[PDB]
Design a protein around this ligand. Structure first.
Ligand code: CA
Ligand code: CA
Ligand code: CA
Length: 128
């Protein structure tokens, strides 16, 4: 199974003291519907609390979508280090329980916050 990835561009602005989470694009995702398609959308939040749980616009009928949506969490830097950033790209099924594509987590203590960390990180298979 070709499980795919999500590219992000994540920064912290120290004049306002806020987190910044630039969700760019996903590539090569599995089809979870009876026509070889997916309806992808990213659920974007922070551990362990879940302060501002976000949802991107749904890009219906594609396995390679482009979101371009920066999600801002207004949190101080001493509280940010312990918190771990989650992105879970989901298939929208309109009526039934929404079938997960996959997910990964990124600790803020591993991110060096000089400018912007911009990288492709891979989506691992979730059973949710
Ligand atoms: Ca589905
Ligand atoms: Ca669907
Ligand atoms: Ca379903």
């Amino acid at each position: 199974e070709k499980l795919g990835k999500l590219q992000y561009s994540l920064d912290y602005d120290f004049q306002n003291n806020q987190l910044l989470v630039g969700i760019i694009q996903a590539a090569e995702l599995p089809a979870l519907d009876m026509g070889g398609t997916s309806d992808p959308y990213v659920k974007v939040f922070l551990l362990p609390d879940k302060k501002k749980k976000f949802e991107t616009k749904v890009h219906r009928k594609t396995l390679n979508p482009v979101f371009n949506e920066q999600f801002t969490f207004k949190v101080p830097y001493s509280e940010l280090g312990g918190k771990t950033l989650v992105m879970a790209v989901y298939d929208f099924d309109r009526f039934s329980k929404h079938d997960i594509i996959g997910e990964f987590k990124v600790p803020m203590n591993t991110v060096d916050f000089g400018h912007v960390t911009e990288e492709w990180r891979d989506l691992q298979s979730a059973e949710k």
